[PDB]
């Protein structure tokens, strides 16, 4: 299937608290593999996956220097944006970028990214044509014109279609065996009291990876897509994820309900019911 190399980059200004904090994080197929943080004792791009450890010293030097250059650009961007939005020099502000490429099974580029946000809102983004820009407001129109006047889309296009794709291929070769990790959910139902003649049945899915999962409750063939409570999928902290979905049912009718768990690691979706303790 498809793959992606994306860098998620942030600077946060701290007037009277020092220089802006700059963090740059790389992802292969949505998995963090590199990180740079300006607040580290000695700021360097670091491996965040073991398969990256085989990249030699010159790789780390070059990319550390690139990050330091991007840090400078972001520092400048922040001062510039302060003027564009006529904001006071004393406030804290954030700039964020998502940059990179998505490639299909056949190695062709599906999508190239270059999106900017100022203070958590869209600023400017490269269009799917890889030639033009969408500016979110008046201020971003200044940048749109500047980058048109610099041919920025062409320099960016060469990176996206060339450099990004080539490096993604290399990273995938080194990381395939690790990135392919799949952990199927292990599921169970818990039983909890509700006022009067009702009980809560909670279907748990634990230990799974990737995080993508669906949990459903059925009463006699019908999916209860109205009264089911569910939590956002959440990290266990150990590389695996957790989710639950619960339903309120009549006391004594617990065996009339079934939970189903859908995951990519499951050949057949799981079916389970409340079982009272052994």
């Amino acid at each position: 299937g498809p793959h992606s190399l994306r860098y998620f980059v942030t600077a946060v200004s701290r007037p009277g608290l020092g220089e802006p904090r700059f963090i740059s994080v790389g992802y292969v197929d949505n998995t963090e593999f590199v990180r740079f943080d300006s607040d580290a004792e000695n700021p360097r791009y670091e491996p965040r996956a073991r398969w990256m450890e085989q990249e030699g010293p010159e790789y780390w030097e070059r990319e550390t220097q690139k990050a330091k250059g991007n840090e400078q650009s972001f520092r400048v961007d922040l001062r510039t944006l302060l003027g564009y939005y006529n904001q006071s020099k004393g406030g804290s502000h954030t700039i964020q970028v998502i940059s990179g490429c998505e490639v299909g099974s056949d190695g062709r580029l599906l999508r190239g990214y270059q999106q900017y946000a100022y203070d958590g809102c869209d600023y400017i983004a490269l269009n799917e044509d890889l030639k033009t820009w969408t500016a979110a407001d008046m201020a971003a129109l200044i940048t749109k014109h500047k980058w048109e006047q610099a041919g920025e889309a062409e320099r960016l296009r060469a990176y996206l279609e060339g450099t990004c794709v080539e490096w993604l291929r290399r990273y995938l070769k080194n990381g395939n065996a690790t990135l392919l990790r799949t952990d199927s959910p292990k599921a169970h139902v818990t039983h909890h009291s509700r006022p009067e003649d009702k009980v809560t049945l909670r279907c748990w899915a634990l230990g799974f990876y990737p995080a993508d999962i669906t949990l459903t409750w059925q009463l006699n063939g019908e999916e209860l897509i109205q009264d089911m409570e569910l939590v956002e999928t959440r990290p266990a902290g150990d590389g695996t994820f957790q989710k639950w979905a619960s339903v309120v049912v009549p006391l004594g009718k617990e065996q009339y309900y079934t939970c189903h768990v859908y995951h990519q690691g499951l050949p057949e979706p799981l079916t389970l019911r409340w079982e009272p303790p052994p």
């Binding site: 961007d77 900017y116 980058w147």
Partner: peptide
Amino acid sequence: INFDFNTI
């Protein structure tokens, strides 16, 4: 590897 960003 990342892109060398321009300034806004």
